[PDB]
């Protein structure tokens, strides 16, 4: 679930306000996605969008609402093992993205861009 994804991003980037900081970034970070990623972070979102699309082919699996079981210790992100096939897969999509986000630089210039032309 997007709210848990937010929780995962807070785990790797504690000073982040995820639903705000990454909801309109580059060509993929945010609703929809197209074109070539603008940077490293936007690249994380392209991979994440893809993962969500794949997690959608799963029998009634919505990456958007499916609530998964994960743990967040001191930075380390863990997707609990009891998760069903969808929750497990979706929790995976967000973990990999949360970790990716934390390793990519945040370039202010790539926030809220004119996707219609740059993507
Ligand atoms: Ca997207």
Swiss-Prot record:
Keyword Disulfide bond in annotation: yes
Entry's cofactor comment: Binds 1 Ca(2+) ion.
One GO CC annotation: extracellular region
Chemical reaction(s) catalysed: a 1,2-diacyl-sn-glycero-3-phosphocholine + H2O = a 1-acyl-sn-glycero-3-phosphocholine + a fatty acid + H(+)
Disulfide bridge map: 11-72, 27-119, 29-45, 44-100, 51-93, 61-86, 79-91
Single GO term (MF): phospholipid binding
Domain of life: Eukaryota
GO biological process, one term: fatty acid biosynthetic process
Residues of the active site: 48, 94
Enzyme Commission code: 3.1.1.4
Keywords annotated in UniProt: Blood coagulation cascade inhibiting toxin, Calcium, Disulfide bond, Hemostasis impairing toxin, Hydrolase, Lipid degradation, Lipid metabolism, Metal-binding, Secreted, Signal, Toxin
Tissue and organ expression note: Expressed by the venom gland.
Protein's cellular compartments: Secreted
Cofactor entry: Ca(2+)
Principal location class: secreted
Residues annotated as binding Ca(2+): 28, 30, 32, 49
Family to which the UniProt record says this protein belongs: Belongs to the phospholipase A2 family. Group I subfamily. D49 sub-subfamily.
Job description of the protein: Snake venom phospholipase A2 (PLA2) that displays edema-inducing and moderate anticoagulant activities. PLA2 catalyzes the calcium-dependent hydrolysis of the 2-acyl groups in 3-sn-phosphoglycerides.
Protein name as catalogued: Acidic phospholipase A2 2
Organism: Ophiophagus hannah (King cobra)
Range covered out of full length: 28 to 146 of 146
